[PDB]
């Protein structure tokens, strides 16, 4: 029904919000050599997935880390330097985060139009019978 | 018999409702890479039908996936990529989804007017001879 | 609204603090017997449901 559109579009609104927050944590950790949890932060990605289970909502199935190798930088005098003297920094790519930032915002706003479009159809469907 | 117009207008309301649900799923899954290259989401579209063997109802004959080739993207960083670093994405075109949203909403509300006006003609018929 | 507003604000705020630490280093180039201060960022995740 038209109410299923609200569930489908609403799921995308939450879905694009997850990717926006993941990108925000990527931009804020692009230069963080250290990290609690004994893990040099690596770029995270939200992998969307259609949950077919007509109406196909979108669900986040889990956040996946980047496969790119960490950026090694020779800083011998740093306390975190290894024997060779290289400290490692996250593999966050700025350009893809900016592209993800644009795409997530554009996709978020176009889901609002569909919810608005379905809202008007239900209101007119209610005016029938009056 | 006494409500032939309602069965046709109502069928259009159910038919145009499915097309909006399909549009919502296409826009909500426009960036769902999922996994592999054949389980990837593809734009779905309802098929309308009219059996002209008075009134010809409109019947949806199932959802059909688009034949457009998948949008390929070079990204040898996503862990769900392939040998050549390509992730195939759904063949959803935003411009055609926006047009379907406009066409579905307006056509759906047009049948509301016809169904609402059809009831008025039935009500006036009861006043014949009075 | 969305919490990414404060998630990015909590990152921009620390960049200014890191900038202050580097500013103190350059102000102390002529100082006698001054040991330079290193600046680093720690990644801390909000553990919980979700």
């Amino acid at each position: 029904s038209l109410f299923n559109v609200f569930n489908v579009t609403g799921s995308a609104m939450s879905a694009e919000s997850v990717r926006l927050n993941t990108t925000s944590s990527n931009l804020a950790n692009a230069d963080s050599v250290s990290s609690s949890a004994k893990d040099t932060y690596k770029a995270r990605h939200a992998v969307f997935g259609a949950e077919l289970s007509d109406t196909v909502p979108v669900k986040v199935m889990g956040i996946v880390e980047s496969d790119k190798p960490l950026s090694a930088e020779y800083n011998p005098d740093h306390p975190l330097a290894n024997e060779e003297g290289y400290i490692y920094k996250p593999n966050v790519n700025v350009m893809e985060e900016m592209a993800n930032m644009i795409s997530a915002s554009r996709a978020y706003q176009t889901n609002v139009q569909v919810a608005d479009s379905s809202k008007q159809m239900l209101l007119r469907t209610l005016q029938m019978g009056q | 018999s006494l409500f032939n117009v309602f069965n046709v207008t109502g069928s259009a309301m159910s038919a145009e409702s499915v097309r909006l649900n399909t549009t919502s799923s296409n826009l909500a899954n426009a960036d769902s890479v999922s996994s592999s290259a054949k389980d990837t989401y593809k734009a779905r579209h309802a098929v309308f039908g009219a059996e002209l063997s008075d009134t010809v109802p409109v019947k949806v004959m199932g959802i059909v996936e688009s034949d457009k080739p998948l949008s390929a993207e070079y990204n040898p960083d996503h862990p769900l990529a392939n040998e050549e670093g390509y992730i195939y994405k759904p063949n959803v075109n935003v411009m055609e989804e926006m047009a379907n949203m406009i066409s579905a909403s307006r056509a759906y509300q047009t049948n509301v007017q016809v169904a609402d006006s059809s009831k008025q003609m039935l009500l006036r018929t009861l006043q014949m001879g009075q | 609204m969305d919490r990414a507003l404060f998630l990015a604000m909590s990152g921009a705020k620390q960049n200014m603090q890191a900038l202050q630490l580097r500013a103190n280093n350059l102000a102390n180039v002529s100082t006698t017997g001054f040991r330079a201060d290193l600046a680093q960022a720690r990644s801390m995740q909000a553990y919980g449901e979700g």
Partner: peptide, 24 residues
């Protein structure tokens, strides 16, 4: 299931299998 390398939001404990993720 789905993605094979999803993360876990629970703090590391090294003794309990994380059930937050779809561990199948």
């Amino acid at each position: 299931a789905g993605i094979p390398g999803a993360l876990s939001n629970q703090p590391p404990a090294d003794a309990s299998i994380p059930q937050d993720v779809a561990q199948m």
